[PDB]
Amino acid sequence: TTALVCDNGSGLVKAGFAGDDAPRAVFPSIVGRPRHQGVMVGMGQKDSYVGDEAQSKRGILTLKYPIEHGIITNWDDMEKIWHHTFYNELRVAPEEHPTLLTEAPLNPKANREKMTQIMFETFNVPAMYVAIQAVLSLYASGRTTGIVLDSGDGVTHNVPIYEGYALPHAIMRLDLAGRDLTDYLMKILTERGYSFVTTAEREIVRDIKEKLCYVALDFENEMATAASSSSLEKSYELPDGQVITIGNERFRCPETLFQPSFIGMESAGIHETTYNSIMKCDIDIRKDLYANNVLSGGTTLYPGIADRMQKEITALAPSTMKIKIIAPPERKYSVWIGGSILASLSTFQQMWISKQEYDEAGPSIVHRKCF
Amino acid sequence: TTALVCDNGSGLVKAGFAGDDAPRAVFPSIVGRPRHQGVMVGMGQKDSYVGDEAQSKRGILTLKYPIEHGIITNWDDMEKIWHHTFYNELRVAPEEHPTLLTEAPLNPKANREKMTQIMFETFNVPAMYVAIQAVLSLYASGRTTGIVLDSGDGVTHNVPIYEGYALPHAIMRLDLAGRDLTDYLMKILTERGYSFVTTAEREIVRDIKEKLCYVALDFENEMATAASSSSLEKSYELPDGQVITIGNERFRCPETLFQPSFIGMESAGIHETTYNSIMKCDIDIRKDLYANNVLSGGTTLYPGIADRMQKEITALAPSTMKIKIIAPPERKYSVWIGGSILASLSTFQQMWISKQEYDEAGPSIVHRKCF
Amino acid sequence: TTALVCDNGSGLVKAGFAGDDAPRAVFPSIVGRPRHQGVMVGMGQKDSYVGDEAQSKRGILTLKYPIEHGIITNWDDMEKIWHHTFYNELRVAPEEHPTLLTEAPLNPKANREKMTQIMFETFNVPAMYVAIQAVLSLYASGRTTGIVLDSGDGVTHNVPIYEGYALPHAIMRLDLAGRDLTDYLMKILTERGYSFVTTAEREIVRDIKEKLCYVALDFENEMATAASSSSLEKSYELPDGQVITIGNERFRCPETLFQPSFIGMESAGIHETTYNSIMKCDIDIRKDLYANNVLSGGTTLYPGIADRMQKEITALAPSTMKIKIIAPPERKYSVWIGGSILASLSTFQQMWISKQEYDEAGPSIVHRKCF
Amino acid sequence: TTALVCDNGSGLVKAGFAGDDAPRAVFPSIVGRPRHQGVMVGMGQKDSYVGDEAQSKRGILTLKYPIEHGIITNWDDMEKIWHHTFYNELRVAPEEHPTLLTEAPLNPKANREKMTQIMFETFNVPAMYVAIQAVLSLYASGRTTGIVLDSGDGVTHNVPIYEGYALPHAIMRLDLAGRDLTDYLMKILTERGYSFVTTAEREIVRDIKEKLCYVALDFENEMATAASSSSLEKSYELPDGQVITIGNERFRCPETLFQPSFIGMESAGIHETTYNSIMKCDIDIRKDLYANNVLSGGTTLYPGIADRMQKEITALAPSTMKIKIIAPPERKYSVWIGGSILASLSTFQQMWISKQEYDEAGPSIVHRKCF
Ligand SMILES: Nc1ncnc2c1ncn2[C@@H]1O[C@H](COP(=O)(O)OP(=O)(O)O)[C@@H](O)[C@H]1O
Ligand SMILES: Nc1ncnc2c1ncn2[C@@H]1O[C@H](COP(=O)(O)OP(=O)(O)O)[C@@H](O)[C@H]1O
Ligand SMILES: Nc1ncnc2c1ncn2[C@@H]1O[C@H](COP(=O)(O)OP(=O)(O)O)[C@@H](O)[C@H]1O
Ligand SMILES: Nc1ncnc2c1ncn2[C@@H]1O[C@H](COP(=O)(O)OP(=O)(O)O)[C@@H](O)[C@H]1O
Ligand SMILES: [Mg+2]
Ligand SMILES: [Mg+2]
Ligand SMILES: [Mg+2]
Ligand SMILES: [Mg+2]
């Protein structure tokens, strides 16, 4: 049987087999095109690079992302990425391999339908399925009750689950994600004298964010300590040299999550969004939801995000009850792990969308089957 | 022999064996159905919960009561409750166990007939019986003369008995019960800012009534003290927190029993209903009926109901004689205790309705046997 | 001269002029009071409705009857009814109009005295009279000998008259009347599932009795036919719909007259009460009393009451003589007709109670004049 | 005298003089605050805009509503709105002008008391009054009997009135209103690709609802026609362009009124809520209530709401009687019209709450005067 699991995401692709411990193929979802003249002969060089190949040669080509905010915008580029992760990296023939895909909540309906057409016609898979990302995150932890805040690169969303029952009317979606955090870092870096405008230079700024930035417990008095002393500065070495220094911008970029007014959005922070979802549910189920808060998604991997979230939540909730933010140690590959577990149960082998059903019903079978 | 005793009631089920001191199984009579979508797999969750299981998971399912005002309205749900109290809780086989059932006065005749069909065919009991609830309340106290006011959750009724002879023409029945008291509390709680509309939130309001409400000796001057001082307020903590305060609504809900015009009914209070029953009997037996007033039924467990009833009764009766309201200390499990006593006498072993009689005569044997 | 005739009765008022054929004003004796809040303005609505007006608006107000069992209990309400039948309906000035009133046998003496005070002082009638109801029933039929059984809504009474001479020691009075028949119908209607408890819903039950109920010749074998076949059922449509079905309760309510043990009274039926009165008279006058039995009063208008009475009477009397129950075709307005005849004879114009006699003697002149 | 009439409502303010035909001032109840930096000088721009001014400049400021679900939550903002409708729009001095206010049923008591304090102290009105909104709706139609369903933007409520008498125990209140309908439209619009998250973009979605949405007679077969053909689609032009298309969402948003499970509420629809109120009244008054159903309130202005309500009501009521939903042509300004009529009668000039009474008694005089 050997079912396949694929996590498209936005900016990172995780692929592997069902029943394993970790994905066997991780690579960025980027397609590049040459930019310059192209002199000399006998080189035999390709016209487009996809995956980790584009990262190595990013100095002469332009990076482009097909998926954005969860929705796929370039369908011609996505067929190139799926071909790369099936024949070149996994080295498998999809003709005898059911696949599992993931999808964010509150997405256009046409997004699901087009994914089914490509897999069932271009690749000719025998079966396929589509599942919500945040539901699979609860399978990895071996739990049944709790509220999951899954923040990635495209979109962060919230959904409460109580004893295997979802509440579709208490689901909140917010655009703020890790991609908008990188752009804010680029803007506030110009006040020190550094300019980063090329699309190939957006990777330089992203790597700085992943290594230096951190979340401060308190914002008012942290800016006071950084204003006087210089003990909060670290150095980064660019690829060609010219080391740089980072001061109070180190803890200012992640703060946008709790104060989304730094870019201009009117929505509330992630600490108030998750409180409104809890108060939208029933009265007697809120007690179990407070003590089962789950964190998932790489943008929730900042040093100190678990203690800051706890401090703000207890300021709103009544003081009688106990609030504990359950942040596991491996939060980035939590969705994939849940997908592998789900695709191995004996009771799940009846909900596959077969080829016969698609031929008789058409692409509209997804909404009647998947969710 | 080991006869069985069951008290269906309305909202609470008492079951046990004959010859014991207390019922061994007490649980609400509630059947619940899931309401929400139901995501995830491998849970193996049931489609309906009955009894104490529904109370634990009441936050996602809907509560429904089959019995109402004494009459059973959902016969499909009642067979589910009887199955729960025979195999799951009592853990007994009804094939070799006679059972005893209770019934309120002035009920539709078809109610008795359908109960006999289910027990004698679905469960195949060897014998069965049906008795009036208020008659059994006199067995518990070891008395022979007196007037019994049995107020429960569905219906309150009155019946006088003098030296082992009943007076069927002096029996009064009034709908006002504990279920209508909870609904009135919900309506008058909105004037302070609290909203309780979900059927799962009716249990929250009921628990407040069972812990805080009390009966005031006088109504006119009690409202004057509560209007000026704030020494009559208590606090209640909701399951999620947000403690609340109760003022003069504390003693206003139980007052509806004595003044049924608060909801809109035209009938008189319980103090005047029991006086009319006494005056409907013979002249020379009224003296023994005045001094043998008996209270039974949980809704007669309010703090102060015994002194208030005495004050109103002596205002109508002549001042020569003595009026004493005999309110025992355990009034909730008084009917069950009387049923256990009755099902153990050697002289009662001849009035069982046998299987042979039912086959020859049919379901109409009850009216010719029971009452 | 134009004397006036008024028949107070109990539950129905008959008024008119002397010398006519039928009463010109018939309306119930009911006074109603508003029950609900009473929102809005500019309506100009009264605080009390009396007569046929209360029947139209009975859905928001409470019905109350002043006269009961023959005796008047609410003297303030009776002055309201008398004012309605003199100025509003008859449209006459009582200052120049002698009036005639009726009274049941064996009544408190204070009942007669208070009626004389009100008429002679509040209304200032020039003359008045009080007569026994059952004596006037013999004037309508143009007879001189016979025994009259007058059953109405308040009380049924018996009195034998032989050739213009009454026998005061052979007069029997029984409370059982049409008002107790309606209450019994309400109680036995609950065994089918219908509840009628509001005082405004007592009119619904009364109308069912006047249209469907009938008297059965034999009771033992009639219950056998109704137990097997369903050919004895009729349908009634309530004002809002929800039609109902009546089975063996159709002929059970009127049976209470012959078997007064259904409510709990110890007295004998109307067939045995009228036999005891005959045997209480002299031996040689019984022959003419047997063949001159007269029926009067609306509660004697049930279909089949004349044949049932004959069957029971001949079972007690000797078989030699002939028994014939003379039931006329218009038995409801028989008392009024007799009153009109009496108030027109030239020999009756000397027994009026004048204003001069009342002033000199006082209210005690009635007992010395009327009976 | 020239009494003043004000209808606060929730989201729309109607003001005018007593004795006219239409309100002279209609404007939204919205207070806005600047959001952005605010460069340049010499502009002289205000710090807060209230009324129609905020709608024009809504692109840079944030809209906020003080009144919500009937209860006022921001008392500082309400004093700003009342000042705007007295000096800026009506251009009147409230020192010599009695005012009339409206209030929804089943509201916190403190809501009425605080309104009296502000008017009698800050504005110094000589007299004032508070009336129920649904009672005034019957004055406009010139009727005395009927059941009124008043659905607005904050809360829909029901109350039956029979011949100028209200039934307080048959009053039902349901939160579902027009504000929850707009939020549902925003959520289901994301499935086509349109995002509307800014509070200033909630006005864009509301305008779409007021122009395109309609109620379908049947829901099951209407979704079948929209699934196959494309004849049920209309186009809307956004302020900057980018026209959009609406398909089956056109008739899905108003359907929430009849099926409140689309959001997650457990209560029944408006067709079943109004049927339960009728069955809660007396038996003989239901006939006049069925034929006098009155519609009022802008959310009852959807194309086809009158025919759909009739179809569902006759499915529950008995088939004998006639049901007619009396939906007038101008249902939005029905409450104001009734208030103008009431404040002009000569008999109403005695129920004003004077300044002298307030000084002697205090703010608690309202409950003893108004309702
Ligand atoms: N150690 C880290 N600290 C902070 N942010 C991180 C870290 N690792 C990854 N990220 C952020 O997480 C994002 C990747 O999220 P990912 O789990 O791939 O979501 P998706 O699968 O939906 O693309 C990147 O944009 C990156 O900015
Ligand atoms: N301590 C108490 N004080 C006041 N009311 C009570 C108390 N305990 C129970 N009740 C009321 O009594 C009702 C239960 O009555 P119950 O004895 O179960 O009658 P039945 O057996 O006919 O259901 C409940 O509705 C509850 O409101
Ligand atoms: N057609 C009928 N069949 C049976 N009973 C009737 C009929 N008409 C009237 N009655 C009964 O007769 C009573 C009216 O009696 P009525 O002649 O008014 O006596 P009174 O004048 O003393 O009130 C009512 O209570 C009603 O129940
Ligand atoms: N033509 C229309 N069709 C449908 N809904 C409407 C229409 N006009 C107004 N509404 C709705 O009615 C609401 C306004 O109700 P309103 O009469 O102002 O009540 P209130 O005075 O209590 O605010 C708005 O929220 C709007 O959604
Ligand atoms: Mg992710
Ligand atoms: Mg009980
Ligand atoms: Mg009569
Ligand atoms: Mg309105």
Inter-chain contact A106–D192, Cβ cutoff 8 Å?
no
CA distances from A48 to A37, A51, A150 (A): 15, 10, 33
Inter-chain contact B38–A168, Cβ cutoff 8 Å?
no
What are the tokens at B297? 């039924």
Could you tell me which residues of chain C have a Cβ less than 8 Å from any Cβ in chain D?
A: 34, 36-43, 45, 57-60, 198, 200-201, 204, 237-242
Q: Which amino acid is at C97?
A: H
Q: Which residues partner with B229 through β-bridges?
A: none
Question: In 3D, which of D115, D132, D46 has the Cα closest to residue D75?
Answer: D115
Question: In 3D, which of D293, D335, D302 has the Cα closest to residue D178?
Answer: D302
Q: Are residues C185 and C134 in contact, defined by beta-carbon separation less than 8 angstroms? A: no
Chains C and A touch (3+ CB pairs under 8 A): no
SS3 C182: helix
Q: Are residues C262 and C250 in contact, defined by beta-carbon separation less than 8 angstroms? A: no
Count CA within 13 A, CB hemisphere, residue B197: 13
Question: In 3D, which of D264, D21, D271 has the Cα closest to residue D151?
Answer: D271
Assigned CATH class of D4-29+65-133+335-369: alpha beta
Q: Which residues touch B231 (CB under 8 Å, ≥6 apart)?
A: none
Q: Cα C196 to chain center, whole Å?
A: 24
Q: Which residues touch B50 (CB under 8 Å, ≥6 apart)?
A: B30, B31, B32, B80, B81, B84
Please tell me the distance from the alpha carbon of residue D269 to that of residue D260, in angstroms, as a whole number: 6
Please tell me the distance from the alpha carbon of residue B152 to that of residue B175, in angstroms, as a whole number: 10
Please tell me the distance from the alpha carbon of residue D66 to that of residue D50, in angstroms, as a whole number: 11
| DSSP-derived secondary structure letter, D253 | S
What are the tokens at A217? 């417990």
Question: In 3D, which of A317, A293, A289, A322 has the Cα closest to residue A305?
Answer: A293
D369 membership: H or E segment, kind and range: helix D365-369
Burial A325-335 (b: 16+ CB within 10 A, else e): bebeeebbbbb
Which residue is associated with the tokens 């979704």?
A: D223
Inter-chain contact C35–B266, Cβ cutoff 8 Å?
yes
DSSP codes, B125-143: -SEEEEEEHHHHHHHHTT-
Tell me the nearest-neighbour CA distance from B362 into chain C, angstroms.
Answer: 14
Inter-chain contact D106–B263, Cβ cutoff 8 Å?
no
Which residue out of B215, B299, B300, B305 has the highest number of ligand 2 atoms within 8 Å of its CB and is therefore the one to mutate? B299
Please tell me the distance from the alpha carbon of residue A84 to that of residue A94, in angstroms, as a whole number: 12
Q: Where are the domains of chain C?
A: 4-29+65-133+333-369, 142-175+269-326, 178-256
Q: From the DSSP assignment, how many helices (H) and strands (E) are in chain C?
A: 13, 19
**Which chain D residue has the Cα nearest residue A281?**
D264
DSSP codes, A67-92: EETTEE--HHHHHHHHHIIIIISS--
The answer to whether the CB of B205 is under 6 A from ligand 2 is no
Give the phi and the psi of residue B45 in degrees, each rounded to 5.
-95, 140
Q: Which residues touch C72 (CB under 8 Å, ≥6 apart)?
A: C66, C78, C111, C114
Please tell me the distance from the alpha carbon of residue D153 to that of residue D177, in angstroms, as a whole number: 5
Q: How was this structure determined?
A: cryo-EM
Give the number of whichever ligand sits closest to the CA of residue C211.
Answer: 3
B187 membership: H or E segment, kind and range: helix B178-189
Burial of A89 (0-12, 13-18, 19+ CB in 10 A): middle
Which of D187, D228, D256, D259 should we substitute to test contact with A (largest number of A Cβ atoms within 10 Å)? D187
Q: Which residues partner with C270 through β-bridges?
A: none
Inter-chain contact B266–C190, Cβ cutoff 8 Å?
no
Beta strands in C137-179 (DSSP E): 146-151, 156-162, 165-166, 172-174
Nearest atom of ligand 3 to the alpha carbon of C297:
17
Q: Which residues partner with D165 through β-bridges?
A: D162
What are the tokens at A201? 């230079």
SS3 D91: coil
* Cα B67 to averaged position of ligand 2 atoms, centre (Å): 15
Please tell me the distance from the alpha carbon of residue D177 to that of residue D144, in angstroms, as a whole number: 27
Cα–Cα–Cα angle for B15, B21, B23, nearest 5°?
15
Which residue is associated with the tokens 């709706």?
A: D137
Inter-chain contact D191–A109, Cβ cutoff 8 Å?
yes
Please tell me the distance from the alpha carbon of residue B99 to that of residue B335, in angstroms, as a whole number: 15
CA distances from C184 to B171, B252, C189, C226, C253 (A): 13, 36, 9, 20, 7
| CATH for the C4-29+65-133+333-369 domain, from 1.10.1530.10, 3.40.50.360, 3.30.565.10, 3.30.420.40 | 3.30.420.40
Which residue is associated with the tokens 């102060």?
A: B304
C-alpha R_g of chain C: 22
Burial of C268 (0-12, 13-18, 19+ CB in 10 A): middle
Which residue is associated with the tokens 């000199």?
A: C360
Is the domain covering C142-175+269-326 a CATH 3.30.420.40 domain?
Answer: yes
Q: Are residues A95 and A231 in contact, defined by beta-carbon separation less than 8 angstroms? A: no
Q: Are residues B74 and B37 in contact, defined by beta-carbon separation less than 8 angstroms? A: no
CA distances from A15 to A95, A102, A133, C3 (A): 17, 12, 15, 113
Which fold does the domain A142-175+268-326 belong to in CATH?
Nucleotidyltransferase; domain 5 (3.30.420)
Please tell me the distance from the alpha carbon of residue B271 to that of residue B158, in angstroms, as a whole number: 11
Burial of C335 (0-12, 13-18, 19+ CB in 10 A): buried
Give the phi and the psi of residue B16 in degrees, each rounded to 5.
175, -170
Give the phi and the psi of residue B370 in degrees, each rounded to 5.
-60, 120
The answer to whether the CB of C153 is under 6 A from ligand 3 is yes
Q: Which residues partner with D72 through β-bridges?
A: D67
Contact residues, chain B, for D169 at CB < 8 Å: 263-264
**Which chain C residue has the Cα nearest residue D346?**
C42
Counting one residue from B and one from D, how many pairs have CB atoms under 8 Å apart? 21
Is it true that C142-175+269-326 and C178-256 share their CATH fold?
A: no
DSSP codes, B320-344: TS---EE--S--TTHHHHHHHHHTT
Is the domain covering A178-256 a CATH 3.90.640.10 domain?
Answer: yes
Q: Are residues D131 and D370 in contact, defined by beta-carbon separation less than 8 angstroms? A: yes
Nearest atom of ligand 1 to the alpha carbon of A179:
25
SS3 D6: strand
Q: What CATH number has the domain spanning A4-37+45-133+335-369?
A: 3.30.420.40
CA distances from B284 to B166, B287, C43 (A): 15, 7, 54
Please tell me the distance from the alpha carbon of residue B363 to that of residue B350, in angstroms, as a whole number: 19
Which residue is associated with the tokens 């909540």?
A: A105
The answer to whether the CB of B160 is under 6 A from ligand 2 is no
DSSP codes, C201-227: GHHHHHHHHHHH----S-STTHHHHHH
What are the tokens at C338? 């007799």
What are the tokens at D45? 């721009």
SS3 C197: coil
What are the tokens at A17? 């087999």
What are the tokens at C168? 């005061």
